[PDB]
Design an enzyme around this catalytic site. Sequence first.
Site, PDB file in Angstrom:
ATOM      1  N   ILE B 105       1.146   3.996   2.356  1.00 54.80           N
ATOM      2  CA  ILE B 105       0.333   5.137   1.959  1.00 54.80           C
ATOM      3  C   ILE B 105       0.510   5.591   0.503  1.00 54.80           C
ATOM      4  CG2 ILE B 105       2.106   6.702   2.846  1.00 54.80           C
ATOM      5  CD1 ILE B 105      -0.211   8.638   3.605  1.00 54.80           C
ATOM      6  N   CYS B 106      -0.576   6.081  -0.090  1.00 52.78           N
ATOM      7  CA  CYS B 106      -0.560   6.576  -1.468  1.00 52.78           C
ATOM      8  C   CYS B 106      -0.181   5.449  -2.444  1.00 52.78           C
ATOM      9  CB  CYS B 106       0.420   7.753  -1.565  1.00 52.78           C
ATOM     10  SG  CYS B 106       0.230   8.836  -3.007  1.00 52.78           S
ATOM     11  N   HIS B 107       1.008   5.515  -3.038  1.00 51.27           N
ATOM     12  CA  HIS B 107       1.460   4.471  -3.962  1.00 51.27           C
ATOM     13  C   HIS B 107       2.139   3.320  -3.211  1.00 51.27           C
ATOM     14  CE1 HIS B 107       0.863   6.101  -8.084  1.00 51.27           C
ATOM     15  NE2 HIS B 107       0.902   7.271  -7.474  1.00 51.27           N
TER      16      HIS B 107
END
Lengths: 191, 173
Positions: B105-107
């Site tokens: 998730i995200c980065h």
Amino acid sequence: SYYHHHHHHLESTSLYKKAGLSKKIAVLITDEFEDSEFTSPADEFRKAGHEVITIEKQAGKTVKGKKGEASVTIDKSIDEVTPAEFDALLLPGGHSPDYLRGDNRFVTFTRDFVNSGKPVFAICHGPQLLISADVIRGRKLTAVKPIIIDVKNAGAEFYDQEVVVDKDQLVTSRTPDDLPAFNREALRLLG
Amino acid sequence: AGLSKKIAVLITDEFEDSEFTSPADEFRKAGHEVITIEKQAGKTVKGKKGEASVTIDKSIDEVTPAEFDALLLPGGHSPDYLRGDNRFVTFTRDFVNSGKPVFAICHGPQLLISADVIRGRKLTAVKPIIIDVKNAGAEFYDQEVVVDKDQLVTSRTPDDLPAFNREALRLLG
């Protein structure tokens, strides 16, 4: 080490201050930039008689270095400047590029500046903005370890060297330890 | 309660707090085992917002992807720090190639880019790295959650956690 109130403009004692003819180095910079990646180049540029213009989203804002050693005042909002008015562009590393590359304004500024042929100096994570502008395919450069794969995926030819200069325009380095070489080539292109 | 599964977590300092705690909470509630991995066991790493503290259970040198059932890759600046070390990249590559579920998730997807195992795979990620995911050959989609071949679960930000956790749990069951 802590750098008390770093300044990036010609000192009030500069002979070049009044006529206002100094070359201008634009700097896309926000919070968590790698401290020395700004203070070192900036200090060298200033000593050389060049002005430095910090650019972010809010003029007058204070952004702090990742290490908390340096805090710099933002001179202009990216909305009120153009690549045209600058002679060169500096892109410090740290987490600053990550924060800025998610905003089309900075990506467009970087892209247009590079396409203008003017010198661009990017160190450590700095190249991330060059990737986002998608202007490095086929060009030679280096960068910090974690993003080497991204630079290559962007079509650039990677070199593991303290500094890489592509077509006498793009100057890239890997870490703060490459600053001496980074500054050397940057200054060279500004002279 | 279904079959408990061991979920490996590659995590270091400055990870996005909730990107570890929310999934962790949901995973534990389902009876799953959450195992954190970094460079040194016993160490305490803290989240980017100084809200979550995480004890490191294992050293990357003392574990194998084989012993885990799934892998969680929280975002923040943690992936940036980890992707600069072959050990975590190799662990990610090997884990994905094993076919086992991976939740990024995200980065988080940055470790997948580094492992170079997403060319032709569908996924999403946080705004700033969209270009990097695309350059890596991935098929990007701007959705709260993307599940590729019932293995790779990816989300964009903490606001996507509900969907992220939902799909992760689904694959764990």
